[PDB]
Amino acid sequence: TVAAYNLTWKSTNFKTILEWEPKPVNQVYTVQISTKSGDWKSKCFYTTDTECDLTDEIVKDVKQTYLARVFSYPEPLYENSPEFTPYLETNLGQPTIQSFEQVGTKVNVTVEDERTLVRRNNTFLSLRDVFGKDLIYTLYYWKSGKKTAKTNTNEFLIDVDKGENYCFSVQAVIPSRTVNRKSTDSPVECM
Amino acid sequence: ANAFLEELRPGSLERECKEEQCSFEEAREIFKDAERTKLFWISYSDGDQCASSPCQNGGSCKDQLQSYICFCLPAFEGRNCETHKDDQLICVNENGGCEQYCSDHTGTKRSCRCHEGYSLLADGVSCTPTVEYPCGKIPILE
Amino acid sequence: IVGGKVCPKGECPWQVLLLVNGAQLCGGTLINTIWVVSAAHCFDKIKNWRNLIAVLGEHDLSEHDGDEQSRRVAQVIIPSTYVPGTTNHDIALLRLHQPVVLTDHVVPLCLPERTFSERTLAFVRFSLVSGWGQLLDRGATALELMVLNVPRLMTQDCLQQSRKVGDSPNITEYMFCAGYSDGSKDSCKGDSGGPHATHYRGTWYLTGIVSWGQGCATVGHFGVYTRVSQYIEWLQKLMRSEPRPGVLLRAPFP
Numbered sequence A: 001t002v003a004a005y006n007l008t009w010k011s012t013n014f015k016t017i018l019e020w021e022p023k024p025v026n027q028v029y030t031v032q033i034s035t036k037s038g039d040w041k042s043k044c045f046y047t048t049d050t051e052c053d054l055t056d057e058i059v060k061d062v063k064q065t066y067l068a069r070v071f072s073y074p075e076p077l078y079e080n081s082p083e084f085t086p087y088l089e090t091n092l093g094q095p096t097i098q099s100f101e102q103v104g105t106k107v108n109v110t111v112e113d114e115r116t117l118v119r120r121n122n123t124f125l126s127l128r129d130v131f132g133k134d135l136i137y138t139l140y141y142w143k144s145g146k147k148t149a150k151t152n153t154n155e156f157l158i159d160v161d162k163g164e165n166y167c168f169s170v171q172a173v174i175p176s177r178t179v180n181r182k183s184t185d186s187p188v189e190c191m
Numbered sequence B: 001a002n003a004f005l006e007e008l009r010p011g012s013l014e015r016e017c018k019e020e021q022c023s024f025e026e027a028r029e030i031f032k033d034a035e036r037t038k039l040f041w042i043s044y045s046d047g048d049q050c051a052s053s054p055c056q057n058g059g060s061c062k063d064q065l066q067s068y069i070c071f072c073l074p075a076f077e078g079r080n081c082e083t084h085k086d087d088q089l090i091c092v093n094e095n096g097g098c099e100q101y102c103s104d105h106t107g108t109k110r111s112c113r114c115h116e117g118y119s120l121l122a123d124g125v126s127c128t129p130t131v132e133y134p135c136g137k138i139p140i141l142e
Numbered sequence C: 001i002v003g004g005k006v007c008p009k010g011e012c013p014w015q016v017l018l019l020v021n022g023a024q025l026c027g028g029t030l031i032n033t034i035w036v037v038s039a040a041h042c043f044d045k046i047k048n049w050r051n052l053i054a055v056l057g058e059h060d061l062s063e064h065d066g067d068e069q070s071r072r073v074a075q076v077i078i079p080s081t082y083v084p085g086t087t088n089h090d091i092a093l094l095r096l097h098q099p100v101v102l103t104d105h106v107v108p109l110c111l112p113e114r115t116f117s118e119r120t121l122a123f124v125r126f127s128l129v130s131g132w133g134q135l136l137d138r139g140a141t142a143l144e145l146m147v148l149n150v151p152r153l154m155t156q157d158c159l160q161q162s163r164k165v166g167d168s169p170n171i172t173e174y175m176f177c178a179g180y181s182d183g184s185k186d187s188c189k190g191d192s193g194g195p196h197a198t199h200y201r202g203t204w205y206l207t208g209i210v211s212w213g214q215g216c217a218t219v220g221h222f223g224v225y226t227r228v229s230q231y232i233e234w235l236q237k238l239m240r241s242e243p244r245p246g247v248l249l250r251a252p253f254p
């Protein structure tokens, strides 16, 4: 048997999967996850895949810091994963402009409040429900010259030249963050 | 798409990329600017990865750039919701819900047992003392 | 115990005090009314094998009360593989000459089945270690039973996180580390043979025995305990056996 290596965390909107190497040959795996003071919980028992979905475990408290490890079977050989703090590290999904209503010389751009894997009361909490004030959306627009706007909510109220057409693109941002501070630009929409 | 002579007509995002599939060039003819065209083309041409309907057991697929995300039903988990949370009644999984001892069994379900001085209750998972002072219990707290 | 707290009287009912010639010697754990699990090195320099006393229901070494029960140690069984002055197989099974009375202050700790202990308890993060050992490295011993909660570590992590020492003992499959490497909390010399009890769903189990370590609560070092799960069978076969002539007995292992 050979100890797993290159343990990586793939997380977007809290959907968190742990991946690793190599392609098991005559060996299966079992994962364990935990917070620094909690007990170790096993997952993906004797799997032959080189991945393990840990979403349901980390969403129990996205502000905790988890450590995961992969056992190897033909104490057993294992490899610890990097520490993971969902709230501080989960990638922000690609936003989606929900719509834009013009009213005179201004335009209201609305950003769809996408849902995350965080469950609560039999429902999926939005990115806003989770991050609250830590989340902002920046707008990148041009007269169909670069322009930008920022909002602490899910909407932008901007000015526009009557008659001319505009195109918009948005990004989710968590200013306080250091890594994975911004999401990828949303699809382009033109009024 | 390009039909005979339509190109004489100015560029139109609607008529060209919405009501039809437009090439990068047609797109570049509407936006003109390079970056603006690229910012548009990344998503427009990315293709919906939710088309395979990868999310199983009644899950919901959410499209992303060159990837997707599955939202599963309570009883499910896994990248594509392929894991049944009700098919993990094995001992190494939280002691198989057993209060004390757990014993695996191929095919059938695991069974629970107890330490001397205790007996298995009817739930088939709990143990209860059968003496006045069972091991591991603290009298002045019980 | 370094960096711990007093175990409220009655909350460590399986703790045993081992005395030789009436002098404090080591700790222990009651697993039934007649047997006590302790450490083997605790008997490295014993000479008066008829002077070994085990006390249960103890708490304050300076005040006698009716919860205290004394019993002569009728037999000390050590693995034939254990070597005096060394660390491997640091375990001992003591047969009390007469059964102790179970009370609110004297109760045994459960000896778990091997697999339950390896597959479940071994992953319960925290467990309690206790005894009347030193309150500081090279310091004096405690008058009141002290208790401490320590986190368990798999050996790979213990070695990786420990500082190498001049030909220090290897951590075998018969051992396991627990504690902290920041020099704040750990068990100590006089706590030897004491229990490393794990709480799991309403019941406490014996998972370890205070055995050895680089000094007491030394920066970059963890406490080392005997992995009791490796001796379940050994203990069970012995407890169903007939007492031998002399006090000391070396039983084969496996």
Ligand SMILES: CC[C@@H](C)[C@@H](NS(=O)(=O)Cc1cccc(C(=O)O)c1)C(=O)N[C@@H](CCC(=N)N)C(=O)NCc1ccc(C(=N)N)cc1
Binding pocket: C041, C044, C083, C084, C085, C086, C087, C137, C138, C168, C169, C186, C187, C188, C189, C190, C191, C192, C210, C211, C212, C213, C214, C215, C216, C217, C222, C223, C224
């Ligand atoms: C040589 C390495 C090692 C074998 C030795 N280390 S030590 O000397 O640093 C232990 C120690 C610590 C503090 C004071 C003293 C002392 O002798 O005064 C001794 C050591 O540990 N020796 C053994 C006995 C060896 C025998 N005679 N069979 C020992 O002292 N064990 C008791 C003990 C229990 C818990 C802890 C703890 N959780 N940390 C530390 C010690």
Ligand SMILES: *[C@@H]1O[C@H](CO)[C@@H](O)[C@H](O)[C@H]1O
Binding pocket: B049, B050, B051, B052, B053, B054, B066, B067, B068
């Ligand atoms: C649907 O398409 C995605 C694209 O990445 C693929 O990963 C799935 O396996 C397929 O079912």
Ligand SMILES: *[C@@H]1O[C@@H](C)[C@@H](O)[C@@H](O)[C@@H]1O
Binding pocket: B058, B059, B060, B061, B071, B072, B073
């Ligand atoms: C998408 O989300 C999943 C969890 C289910 O509720 C589906 O019915 C829904 O479409």
Ligand SMILES: [Ca+2]
Binding pocket: B001, B002, B003, B006, B007, B016, B026
């Ligand atoms: Ca065209």
Ligand SMILES: [Ca+2]
Binding pocket: B001, B002, B003, B006, B015, B016, B020
């Ligand atoms: Ca056309």
Ligand SMILES: [Ca+2]
Binding pocket: B007, B010, B011, B012, B026, B029
């Ligand atoms: Ca055109």
Ligand SMILES: [Ca+2]
Binding pocket: B015, B019, B020
């Ligand atoms: Ca057309």
Ligand SMILES: [Ca+2]
Binding pocket: B014, B015, B018, B019
């Ligand atoms: Ca149209």
Ligand SMILES: [Ca+2]
Binding pocket: B025, B029
């Ligand atoms: Ca052209």
Ligand SMILES: [Ca+2]
Binding pocket: B007, B025, B026, B029
């Ligand atoms: Ca053209």
Ligand SMILES: [Ca+2]
Binding pocket: B046, B047, B048, B049, B063, B064, B065, B066, B067
């Ligand atoms: Ca896509």
Ligand SMILES: [Ca+2]
Binding pocket: C058, C059, C060, C061, C062, C063, C064, C065, C068
């Ligand atoms: Ca006393």
